[PDB]
Design an enzyme around this catalytic site. Structure first.
Site, PDB file in Angstrom:
ATOM      1  N   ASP A   2       0.175  -3.899   4.241  1.00  0.00           N
ATOM      2  CA  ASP A   2       1.108  -4.722   3.470  1.00  0.00           C
ATOM      3  C   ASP A   2       2.149  -3.831   2.782  1.00  0.00           C
ATOM      4  OD1 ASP A   2       1.987  -7.306   2.434  1.00  0.00           O
ATOM      5  OD2 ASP A   2       1.404  -6.560   0.441  1.00  0.00           O
ATOM      6  N   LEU A   3       1.970  -2.520   2.887  1.00  0.00           N
ATOM      7  CA  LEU A   3       2.868  -1.578   2.227  1.00  0.00           C
ATOM      8  C   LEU A   3       4.354  -1.733   2.585  1.00  0.00           C
ATOM      9  CD1 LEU A   3       3.138   0.565   0.183  1.00  0.00           C
ATOM     10  CD2 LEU A   3       2.400   2.295   1.843  1.00  0.00           C
TER      11      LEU A   3
END
Ligand code: HEC
Ligand code: HEC
Lengths: 79, 489, 337
Positions: free
Chosen positions: A33-34
């Site tokens: 999700d970075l």
């Protein structure tokens, strides 16, 4: 989390904690999700926004799972 | 380099200086030293403003000295400047908390004062620099831009008007000071703070005397604006930062580990030669029927001791900012006061605590290290004791504090879900001092989905004696790293 | 013949041959970092377009040769323009509709400008029209007959591209307000091509149920049919998990949602069919032309194929160097065998 000073309260799913007051709804692993957080600058106070402020922050780390160690903190490390 | 110099040689390239002397934008806002640091950093980062280390420091200092806040204007929000880990942040109402405190602290907002037009420019800066802001949770649920114009900007303008900058500190803080305070996880301390003026800064040495030993740190400090004291000191490979307020010749505030701001202590310091004044007494509690050593920190305390009914004892030593007492309480639990050198010393007599709490009771820790450039962020906990008080009230707004108590610490899963994931097994561990150390950062192939060593944990503390039914829990989120951080979160 | 066009940071578009389950071609774009955002494929599967450069530009590329045929830069010295997640090619392939969130850059302050929709002629890449559009619109999608341009914002905005006006708003924020709490919609994924249906899950709650009770929260599905022009919103299950996006199959009988789990829904019963866990978080969802394969992407650097009926994993195609797709849109197109 008014007690979690410095963390975000925008749960999409969030960064420090998720909408359910836990950590299991955050990206699994976080690295997945970075860039979803970084590229659209969804949590600009916690993750570097490459959309405007830090365009080259993820340079050299295309494979986030393998090259996450290349990603730097944008705060010179101080008080 | 001087501030005026940087304004004319660097800032003037874009910022117009009106005929009245005032500078566009620059003279329409007031904020803390940390605030000005962030603004100047953005000029360098976002707009390619080239600044040498000396120029950067000079302009930030100049702005803090001429366009800062008074100490009163920082009341209730100093926690964000001190990097205090045990804090609570919110805005005046739900609208402002959700609108302005969902990314960074609302404190970042409350520590600024601006003209109506400038608050307008600030809001335009946000949507202009962060265009997806209006698409995020708490923003896509409303007409963000319409509301920003009709309600938020006018609220900011009305609530945080520009006003006028206070006069800068104009005295000489040089000299020897006596101090007292405490460091969560280690305990109470007394000590000395010595300042020696050097140009516009001060050479500084701080000595912390704990029950088991002492250590000194030396460095440089300075007073910014009306009374914001900032200093960096070191001893060996350890560096600490001091974030104090200086008012009426007295320092108060927090200092912390430069490499881990969650670790630090709070203190107050006054000139060593000052008239009789008590800074603190440690311990502040007396176990009924038990003679105990008490260190009363302060100036000119002497040995003239007057004790009340339930307490007997004597003075063992005095001088150098500390008078040591040997007392024994007898009677019913409750507040007890004595006088030393004409100064009141408040204590609390008790046989056993009615309960203990964990401070903080809700907090985070962050994974780190593991070859990465971001270090782990620990979480420090302390078991506090309490006395129900007069109305019993087992846990209400009238209880009597007994202070931190030694205890056994343990971690466990917060709920069934966390237990299934075995969070307590991979999220880290807590030691006997209540210090929780998180696990290594990065994906962990041993966990499902190769997820990180994050975890939804519960911290359990257990204290001692009499009836011995003392246990408290804290909610701990062992979470992920933050890649963006700033002087003011 | 099915192919997938997937963005890969920092400057690539990868064409995947779904049948061979392998990479067909890698197109590299100049000045495209940190990642392409919204790719689009023209009818025929030979030419494609994609927003790049922090969403401030768009390039036209030849999918077979890999050469950049043209470029559009939305920003100017005094005005920065972000297309964000809004860029759509008309069904006849002649017109590009690009969303524009602009900010005027003055000497020492910013001035947010009204959002717009700009129309560019696809063949010449020339700016032909610009009209004010509602703010907070994520995806733009053309009606199949090309007479309307839809924008997913706080309401489903129906715009007339010829007149440059907002002619109708299909209710989202006020949907069944007497019964449900204001719908929460997070959707930035363009993946309606296989069905002609732009769909997204949304979250809400029954107003007459204790907000402290988990049973109160429900997961709904929003489907905007680009062919019929009709939008439907309905509850499909009690909310126990979150999905980032959804894609509908060609038959319009099923929708698939994903994030940390993959779940199929029956659009005829508006109920769940099956759910399976995922090896890691995914964002995007698409469905093959024959409707038998569900493709997951985004987040990391692999496209995962699942059987549409059993939800069993069929295979995985890794992008070169495992380059992440982030939240960029992943499209599925065809080429006549
Ligand atoms: C042109 C390359 C600039 C130079 C040189 C400096 N500043 Fe600036 N500043 C510039 C812009 C385009 C903006 C508006 C957008 C933004 O980033 O905010 C600003 C703004 C400021 C502000 C107000 C910010 C706010 O809180 O709203 C301040 C206080 C400010 N600038 C200060 C400043 C100083 C002290 C400078 C000399 C070191 C300086 N700026 C130079 C562009 C440019
Ligand atoms: C996340 C999308 C944010 C929301 C919502 C708000 N702010 Fe913010 N703010 C954000 C960031 C990432 C930053 C740092 C920008 C940098 O690179 O310097 C800030 C900063 C501020 C500041 C300091 C500006 C300065 O003095 O130079 C202020 C005063 C501020 N923010 C105020 C503010 C208000 C009033 C908000 C509600 C409308 C608000 N912010 C929301 C990110 C986000």
């Amino acid at each position: 989390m008014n007690a979690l000073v410095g963390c975000t309260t925008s749960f999409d799913p969030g960064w420090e904690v998720d909408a359910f007051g836990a950590v299991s709804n955050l990206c699994q692993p976080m690295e997945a999700d970075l860039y979803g957080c970084a590229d659209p600058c969804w949590w600009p106070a916690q993750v570097a926004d490459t959309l405007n402020t830090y365009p080259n922050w993820s340079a050299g780390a295309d494979d986030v799972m393998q090259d996450w160690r290349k990603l730097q903190s944008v705060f010179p490390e101080t008080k | 380099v001087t501030g005026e110099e940087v304004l004319q040689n660097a800032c003037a390239a874009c910022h117009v200086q009106h005929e009245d002397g005032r500078w566009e934008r620059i003279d329409a806002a007031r904020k803390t030293p940390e605030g000005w640091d962030m603004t100047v950093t953005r000029m360098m980062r976002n707009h390619g403003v080239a600044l040498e280390p000396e120029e950067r420091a000079a302009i930030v200092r100049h702005l803090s000295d001429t366009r800062g806040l008074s100490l009163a204007e920082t009341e209730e929000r100093r926690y964000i400047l001190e990097r205090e880990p045990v804090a609570w942040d919110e805005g005046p109402d739900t609208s402002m908390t959700q609108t302005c405190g969902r990314c960074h602290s609302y404190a970042r907002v409350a520590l600024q004062r601006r003209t109506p037009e400038d608050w307008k420019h600030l809001v335009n800066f946000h949507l202009g620099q962060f265009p997806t802001l209006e698409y995020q949770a708490l923003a896509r649920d409303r007409d963000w831009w319409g509301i920003a114009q009709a309600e938020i900007i006018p609220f900011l303008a009305r609530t945080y008007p520009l006003g006028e900058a206070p006069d800068a500190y104009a005295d000489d803080a040089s000299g020897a000071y006596v101090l007292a305070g405490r460091q969560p996880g280690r305990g109470d301390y007394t000590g000395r703070l010595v300042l020696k003026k050097a140009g516009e800064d001060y050479e500084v040495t701080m000595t912390l005397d704990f029950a088991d030993g002492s250590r000194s740190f030396s460095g440089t400090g300075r007073i910014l604006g009306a009374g914001e004291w900032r200093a960096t000191l070191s001893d060996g490979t350890v560096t600490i930062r001091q974030i104090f307020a200086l008012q009426d010749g007295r320092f108060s505030g927090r200092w912390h580990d430069a490499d881990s701001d969650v670790i630090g202590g709070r203190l107050a310091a006054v000139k060593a030669d000052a008239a009789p004044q008590v800074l603190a007494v440690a311990p502040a509690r007396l176990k009924i029927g038990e003679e105990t050593q008490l260190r009363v920190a302060g100036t000119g305390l002497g040995s003239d001791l007057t004790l009340p009914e339930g307490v007997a004892g004597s003075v063992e030593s005095a001088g150098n900012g500390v008078t040591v007492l040997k007392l024994t309480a007898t009677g019913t639990p409750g507040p007890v006061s004595l006088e030393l050198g004409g100064q009141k010393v408040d204590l609390v007599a008790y046989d056993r605590p009615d309960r203990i709490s964990i401070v903080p009771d809700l907090t985070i820790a962050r994974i780190g290290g593991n070859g990465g450039p971001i270090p782990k962020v620990p979480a420090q906990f302390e078991a506090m004791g309490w006395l129900n008080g007069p109305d019993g009230q087992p846990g209400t707004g009238d209880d009597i504090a007994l202070g931190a108590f030694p205890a056994s610490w343990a971690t466990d899963n917060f709920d069934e879900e966390a237990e299934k994931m075995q969070d307590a097994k991979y999220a880290g561990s807590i030691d006997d001092t209540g210090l929780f150390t998180p696990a290594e950062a990065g994906p962990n192939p041993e966990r499902p989905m190769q997820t990180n060593n994050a975890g939804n944990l519960k911290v359990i503390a257990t204290v001692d004696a009499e009836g011995e039914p003392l246990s408290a829990e804290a909610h701990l989120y062992a979470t992920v790293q933050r890649f963006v951080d700033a002087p003011i979160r | 013949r099915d192919y997938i066009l997937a963005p890969a940071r920092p400057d690539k578009l990868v064409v995947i041959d779904t049948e061979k389950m392998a990479v067909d071609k890698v197109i590299t774009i100049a000045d495209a970092g940190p990642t392409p955002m919204v790719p689009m494929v023209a009818p025929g599967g030979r030419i494609a377009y994609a927003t790049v450069n922090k969403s401030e530009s768009l390039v036209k590329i030849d999918l077979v040769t890999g050469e950049t045929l043209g470029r559009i830069d939305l920003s100017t010295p005094e005005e920065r323009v972000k297309s964000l997640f809004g860029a759509a090619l008309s069904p006849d392939g002649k017109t590009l509709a690009i969303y524009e969130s602009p900010v005027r850059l003055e000497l020492t302050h910013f001035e947010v400008q009204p959002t717009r929709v700009a129309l560019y002629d696809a063949e010449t890449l020339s700016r032909r029209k610009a009209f004010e559009a509602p703010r907070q619109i994520t995806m733009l999608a053309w009606a199949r007959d090309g007479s309307k341009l839809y924008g997913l914002g706080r309401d489903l905005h129906v715009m007339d591209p010829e007149a440059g006006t907002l002619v109708e708003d299909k209710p989202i924020q006020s949907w069944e307000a007497e019964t449900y709490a204001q719908p929460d919609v997070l959707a930035v994924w363009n993946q309606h091509e296989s069905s002609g249906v732009m769909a997204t899950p949304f979250y809400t709650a029954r107003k007459d149920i204790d907000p402290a009770d988990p049973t109160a929260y429900r997961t709904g599905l929003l489907t905007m049919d680009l062919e019929t022009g009709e939008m439907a919103m309905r509850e499909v299950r009690i909310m126990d998990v979150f999905y980032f996006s959804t894609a509908v199959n060609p038959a319009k009988t099923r929708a698939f949602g994903a994030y940390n789990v993959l779940e199929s829904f029956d659009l005829e019963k508006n109920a769940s069919i099956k759910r399976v866990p995922l090896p890691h978080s995914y964002y995007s969802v698409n469905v093959s032309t024959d409707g038998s394969t569900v493709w997951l992407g985004g987040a990391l650097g692999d496209l995962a194929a699942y059987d549409a009926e059993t939800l069993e994993k069929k295979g995985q195609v890794d992008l070169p160097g495992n380059a992440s797709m982030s939240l960029a849109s992943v499209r599925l197109f065809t080429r006549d065998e």
